[PDB]
Structure formats: structure tokens, C-alpha cells
Amino acid sequence: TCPFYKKIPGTGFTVDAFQYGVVEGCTAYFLTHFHSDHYAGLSKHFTFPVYCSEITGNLLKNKLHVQEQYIHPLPLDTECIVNGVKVVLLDANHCPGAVMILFYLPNGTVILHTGDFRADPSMERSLLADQKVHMLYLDTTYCSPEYTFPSQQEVIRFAINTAFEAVTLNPHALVVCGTYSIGKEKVFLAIADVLGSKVGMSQEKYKTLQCLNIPEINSLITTDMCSSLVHLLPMMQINFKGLQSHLKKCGGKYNQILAFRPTGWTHSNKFTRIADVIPQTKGNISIYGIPYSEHSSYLEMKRFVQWLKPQKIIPTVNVGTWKSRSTMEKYFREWKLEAGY
Numbered sequence: 001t002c003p004f005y006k007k008i009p010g011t012g013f014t015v016d017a018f019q020y021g022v023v024e025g026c027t028a029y030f031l032t033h034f035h036s037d038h039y040a041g042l043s044k045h046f047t048f049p050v051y052c053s054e055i056t057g058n059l060l061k062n063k064l065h066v067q068e069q070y071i072h073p074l075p076l077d078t079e080c081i082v083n084g085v086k087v088v089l090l091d092a093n094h095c096p097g098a099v100m101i102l103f104y105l106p107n108g109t110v111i112l113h114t115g116d117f118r119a120d121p122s123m124e125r126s127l128l129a130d131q132k133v134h135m136l137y138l139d140t141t142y143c144s145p146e147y148t149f150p151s152q153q154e155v156i157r158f159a160i161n162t163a164f165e166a167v168t169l170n171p172h173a174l175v176v177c178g179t180y181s182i183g184k185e186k187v188f189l190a191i192a193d194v195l196g197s198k199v200g201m202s203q204e205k206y207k208t209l210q211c212l213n214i215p216e217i218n219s220l221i222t223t224d225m226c227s228s229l230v231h232l233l234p235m236m237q238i239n240f241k242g243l244q245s246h247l248k249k250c251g252g253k254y255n256q257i258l259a260f261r262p263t264g265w266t267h268s269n270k271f272t273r274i275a276d277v278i279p280q281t282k283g284n285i286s287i288y289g290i291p292y293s294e295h296s297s298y299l300e301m302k303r304f305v306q307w308l309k310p311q312k313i314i315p316t317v318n319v320g321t322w323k324s325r326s327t328m329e330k331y332f333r334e335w336k337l338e339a340g341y
């Protein structure tokens with residue numbers, strides 16, 4: 001049964017609630033983004049209206065075979081009426097196609113559902129600037145002050161400089177990047193761009209990327225692995241055994257692998273600066289874990305909330321333990337006392 005924090009009061013709507021069967025009272029199912037913990041349950045046999053971004057709706061039709069007549073894509077930054085309720089979709093700064101949803105309830109209440117997001121000061125000048133928000137359904141993934149990480153731009157600078165040095169030292173080095181979902185495409189695209197190469201990958205992953213409306217993509221990716229020196233592999237294969245096996249398959253074209261695992265946070269964040277990050281090495285294989293996050297840090301989250309000044313916060317992540325829930329509530333009260341709302 002569907003948990004309360006997936007239900008929008010005063011409407012017929014749910015958010016990211018496809019694994020519960022037919023939800024009683026639901027007339028429209030919203031999907032914030034195409035990540036499996038959120039789409040779990042969708043398939044070609046789904047026959048209720050699904051509301052989403054254009055990019056999410058391309059992935060629904062092509063990857064999950066949802067029939068077209070049930071996909072209702074909405075443009076971003078545009079007031080739309082759904083089953084008699086005004087809604088707006090906003091960019092969530094998460095993975096491609098990911099949105100936050102503003103609901104303007106018939107009684108005057110305004111609710112923001114962040115989906116998954118990485119808060120940014122640019123959001124303070126979207127359509128959120130223009131009215132009061134009463135209730136915030138908040139992505140609390142990293143809601144504790146230990147969670148610090150660098151900007152995406154610093155992490156990509158590290159990656160490009162590391163790859164360009166290695167390959168200029170050794171033109172027979174292969175670069176490998178791990179993936180298991182959409183998101184984080186800048187990692188492998190920025191490295192292929194500095195090297196003058198396309199990114200090579202499986203037909204299944206090429207198919208996924210072709211649904212993303214990324215400009216000039218035909219110029220940047222390929223299924224011809226032999227023509228590429230940046231390869232994408234499943235995240236599970238980014239270990240010394242998996243990479244040794246891959247290097248065998250390349251037929252003596254290469255004699256070294258430099259590999260990247262874009263993690264979110266890891267405890268090596270609490271001690272070490274990005275500049276100081278080092279790989280794990282075995283023979284001619286090196287693996288870098290790089291802290292490329294598509295979720296808010298603690299400080300980014302706190303800034304957004306202190307700017308928005310909601311009357312009520314409903315966390316959507318870390319809600320399964322009493323210790324987590326008590327920790328989050330304590331920070332919410334701090335933020336409200338410091339800012340004065």
C-alpha cells in the first residue's frame with residue numbers, strides 16, 4: 001500500500017507511486033524522473049494517464065513500451081491544467097528529464113514536490129519566486145552536515161585533466177567509465193571531448209541515450225567500440241577482474257586502463273579535497289572514485305529551504321528509521337529558527 005508521502009492531498013494525484021497496484025482515488029499518476037526506484041511497476045500493460053517531462057515520456061515509450069495514448073508529456077516552466085488542477089514542471093537539476101512539480105490546489109494551498117533534486121541558487125529565479133509555498137515534499141537524501149562534496153564543474157575539471165594527462169603520456173591507454181542508470185552523462189562526454197573520440201557503448205545504452213534530447217549527440221556516442229577510446233561499461237564491471245577481462249577483449253589495441261566510478265558521497269569526502277583524490281591501482285589498471293553528485297549537499301539543501309520558507313516539510317528519503325526521521329526534524333527546526341520564518 002502506498003505511503004502517505006506519495007499522495008497529494010486535495011487532489012486525485014500520486015507521485016512516483018507505480019508499485020502499489022491501483023491506488024484508490026488516483027486519477028493521474030505523476031513520474032518525476034526515469035530512475036528504477038521511482039518508475040518501479042510501469043510497463044506496456046499500464047492503462048492510467050502518466051504525467052511527466054518529454055524526455056521521461058520518450059524513455060517510457062522506448063524502454064518500458066508504455067503505450068503512447070497513456071503518456072502525457074508537459075512542457076517545462078508552463079502553467080498546465082490537469083484534471084482541473086493547475087500544475088507546473090520545473091527543472092530538478094538531477095538526471096535528464098527530471099522535474100519538480102508545483103501543484104496549485106483548489107483551496108489556495110501551494111505544494112512543491114522536489115522529486116530527486118540538486119538544489120541550486122538558479123532555482124530562486126524560476127516560477128518559484130512568484131508565490132508562497134505552503135508544503136514542501138523534500139529530497140532529503142543527504143540531510144546531515146557530514147555530507148559535503150565539490151561542485152560538478154570542479155569534479156569534471158579533475159576528470160578531464162586526469163584523462164588527458166594519462167592518454168597523452170600513453171596513447172595506448174583505454175579510458176572506461178561506469179554507468180547503471182541515466183544521469184552523470186557529463187563525466188564520459190567531457191572526457192571523450194578532450195580526447196577527440198566518441199564514446200563507445202552497448203546497443204541498449206546507445207538506445208537510452210538517444211531518448212535524451214542531448215544536442216549534437218549523434219556526434220558524441222557510438223556502438224562501434226573499435227573506433228572509440230572511451231568505453232562505457234556496467235558499474236558492476238568497474239573492478240580489477242572486470243577490467244582485466246575487458247582489456248583482453250580489445251585484441252592488443254590497448255595496454256593500460258584508466259577507469260572512473262562516479263559515486264555520490266563516500267566518507268573519503270570528510271578528509272580529502274578533490275585535488276588530492278588518488279586511484280586504486282593493480283598492475284596496468286587504475287580506478288578513480290569521483291564524488292559526482294546529482295543530489296543536494298547539506299548546505300545546498302539548507303539554502304534552498306531557508307529561501308523558500310515553507311510552512312510544513314515532508315521528507316521523501318531516509319523515512320524508514322526513527323533515528324533518521326528525528327535527525328531530519330531537528331535540522332528543519334534549526335533552519336527555521338536561524339532564518340526566522
Ligand code: NI
Nearest residue numbers: 033035094116
Ligand atoms: Ni533519482
